[PDB]
Amino acid sequence: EYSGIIYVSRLPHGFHEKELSKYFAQFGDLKEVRLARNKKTGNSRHYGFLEFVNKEDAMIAQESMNNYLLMGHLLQVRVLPKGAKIEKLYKYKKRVPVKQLKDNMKQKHEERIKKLAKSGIEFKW
Amino acid sequence: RKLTRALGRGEVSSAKRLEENRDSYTLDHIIKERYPSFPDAIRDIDDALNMLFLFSNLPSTNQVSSKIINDAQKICNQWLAYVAKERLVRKVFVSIKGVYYQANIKGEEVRWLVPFKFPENIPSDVDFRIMLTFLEFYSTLLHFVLYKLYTDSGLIYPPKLDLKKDKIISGLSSYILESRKYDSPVASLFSAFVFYVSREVPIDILEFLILSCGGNVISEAAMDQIDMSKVTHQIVDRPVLKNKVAGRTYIQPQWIFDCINKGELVPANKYLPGEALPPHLSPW
């Protein structure tokens, strides 16, 4: 038999933790919610997780929204076995001397030149 | 019902088709059988004109359908332009509830109101659709009788109105007259006069009187968007007045009221405010 945790999928844009919380409050008191945001130019990879409190709340929500529709994604949803222990996905926003390095440039210029020379593709300079 | 069926089923092109393809009702046969025709009509138009000039002033909201209002305003101004161009007013009496008039139009002397142009407030205790229906009947009535009037005078009925005038004043300069002596003496009083009215006083009742008693006019407020060449008179109801000039007498409208109400053309001696007034000297 299952756990209260749920897996969801195929989310569209504009659908965030606030939307999940306010929507799925209706199917009972929600314990905690979390979705999948990118850690780079932070936007969703269109899935998430939730447990409202209960196994029965989870399964009735799944029975309702198993193949639910909106514009041209459609939500699929999975009740899990016991536990399954949401652990991760901290929320991520959109993350935002001269002569010494000149000698470094000057020497590694020669280094790349000898590297292409010993490939071997011969070169002056 | 058909339209409702249509809009439930969609079919909005068909709904427009239904609405354009209908022929609503008219009341010409009702009038021209109920009133035989002319003297009775002009006798009993008074209660019509009262409610019309009321509805032209009161505000638009639900229960109003302000197309109604602009129609009533149009026929009101048509009526006023006809009677003022043909120079018939016989009494005037200012009061708190607007002003009553009196005119010997083709025999019987019709008395009627034109209220003050101000934002009255509504009870929401009166029942309205009855009064609207009254108005629709009266509007049709006046449309018929006024067509008859313009025609028997001989005139281009109904009057066009130039938008550049309508957008500045929306007055009696609008609804311009095109054809196809007088009441002797009280027509053509102020003959060859010019009144520069101050902005301070409301033209809403000055201009019917002034144009009935023939004389040209210019307003202060009229030139807000855009000469005093031959101006003869100045009018104001302000305590202080400046820079007053010698070309004009600086007078009050009770002068006009007494002048037409007695047909005497009293001087402007008891005038040039802020001296007090000969109080109203009502006709009754």
Partner: protein, 50 residues
Amino acid sequence: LRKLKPEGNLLYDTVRKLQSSGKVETRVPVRKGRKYKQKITEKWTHKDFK
């Protein structure tokens, strides 16, 4: 005359003229009213969706 505040509601007064001159009966516009409950209950379909 700028001082002049008009007074008296022409709606009330002309309606008095209407009721006075024997054209119309004296009346309220009075708003809605029901005698019985017009009972609510649930459709068959919502009742048996199980």
